[PDB]
Amino acid sequence: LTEIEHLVQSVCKSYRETCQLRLEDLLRQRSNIFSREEVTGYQRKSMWEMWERCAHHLTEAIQYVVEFAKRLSGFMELCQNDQIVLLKAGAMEVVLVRMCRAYNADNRTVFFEGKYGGMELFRALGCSELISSIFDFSHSLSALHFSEDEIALYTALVLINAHRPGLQEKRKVEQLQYNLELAFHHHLHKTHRQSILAKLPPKGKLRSLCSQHVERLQIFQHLHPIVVQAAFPPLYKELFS
Ligand SMILES: O=C(O)c1ccc(-c2nn(C(=O)c3c(Cl)cccc3C(F)(F)F)c3cccc(F)c23)c(F)c1
């Protein structure tokens, strides 16, 4: 009925449509785990081949988040400067949250290229601390057993944040943010899930993990650049220098 319950519906719709894999497909594939032969197969690959595989998977993930943002009510009505500022700071933070869906807390594995595997699968990359921190973030997020609607509403709030430095129309961003906070709060009350609010990761944790991740991606892109057909060209030039 209210403009808020419709907001919940459209945010969940944008998310349902911009998801790469279905939650039940990832849950049913938890049995399909890489063999020790397939693991060594990945470990023996060049850093540069592993980088190309991961770089493409991560650019495609960002592109789905870009589409998710495009479909959020009022995002397109914000100015290009504000759209870049939000996506630059938040798109990879959304990808990192989304990642908990493809993470199995039982054996500490992630769904990568058709099967589940441990962090050792990424050895050739030579950035074990960063990969361990990503696996740790997904492990803490998985303990919340986030529903699909909760992850949709929370990721919208990760993106729509008026506190990002460099915004031109801060007030137009605040209005979008306040409506999404009401929508998230309203939904958690309706479903008796307000208890996750105290369990959500601190703002600084996500920002800190994301800044470390993107800077490492930026080091690899400098050393071995990949080519990507840009979905949002002005965003692409701000990240790919
Ligand atoms: O318009 C597009 O299609 C588009 C696609 C990807 C990005 C993007 N890349 N990105 C990387 O960290 C990244 C990735 Cl995922 C792989 C290899 C190289 C990079 C690099 F570090 F170079 F940016 C991002 C980090 C945060 C926010 C982003 F928006 C991006 C982008 F800005 C635009």
UniProtKB/Swiss-Prot annotation:
* Cell compartments where the protein resides: Nucleus
Ranges for the NR LBD domain?
3-241
The conditions that induce or repress this protein are given as:
Up-regulated in the state of obesity.
Q: Where is this motif: AF-2?
A: 235-240
Function according to Swiss-Prot or TrEMBL: Nuclear receptor that binds DNA as a monomer to ROR response elements (RORE) containing a single core motif half-site 5'-AGGTCA-3' preceded by a short A-T-rich sequence. Key regulator of cellular differentiation, immunity, peripheral circadian rhythm as well as lipid, steroid, xenobiotics and glucose metabolism. Considered to have intrinsic transcriptional activity, have some natural ligands like oxysterols that act as agonists (25-hydroxycholesterol) or inverse agonists (7-oxygenated sterols), enhancing or repressing the transcriptional activity, respectively.
**Distribution of this protein across tissues and organs:** Isoform 1 is widely expressed in many tissues, including liver and adipose, and highly expressed in skeletal muscle. Isoform 2 is primarily expressed in immature thymocytes.
Q: How does it assemble?
A: Interacts (via AF-2 motif) with the coactivator NCOA2 (via LXXLL motif). Interacts with the corepressor NCOR1. Interacts with CRY1. Interacts (via AF-2 motif) with the coactivators NCOA1 and PPARGC1A (via LXXLL motif). Interacts (via AF-2 motif) with PROX1. Interacts with FOXP3. Interacts with NR0B2.
Effect noted on mutating F112Q? Completely abolishes transcriptional activity
Q: What's the record's remark on domains?
A: The AF-2 (activation function-2) motif is required for recruiting coregulators containing LXXLL motifs such as NCOA1 and NCOA2.
Which protein, by its recorded name, is this?
Nuclear receptor ROR-gamma
Which disease is the protein involved in? Immunodeficiency 42: An autosomal recessive primary immunodeficiency characterized by increased susceptibility to concomitant candidiasis and mycobacteriosis. Candidiasis is characterized by persistent and/or recurrent infections of the skin, nails and mucous membranes caused by organisms of the genus Candida. Mycobacteriosis is characterized by infections caused by moderately virulent mycobacterial species, such as Bacillus Calmette-Guerin (BCG) vaccine, environmental non-tuberculous mycobacteria, and by the more virulent Mycobacterium tuberculosis.
Domain of life of the native organism: Eukaryota
Could you say which protein family the record assigns here? Answer: Belongs to the nuclear hormone receptor family. NR1 subfamily.
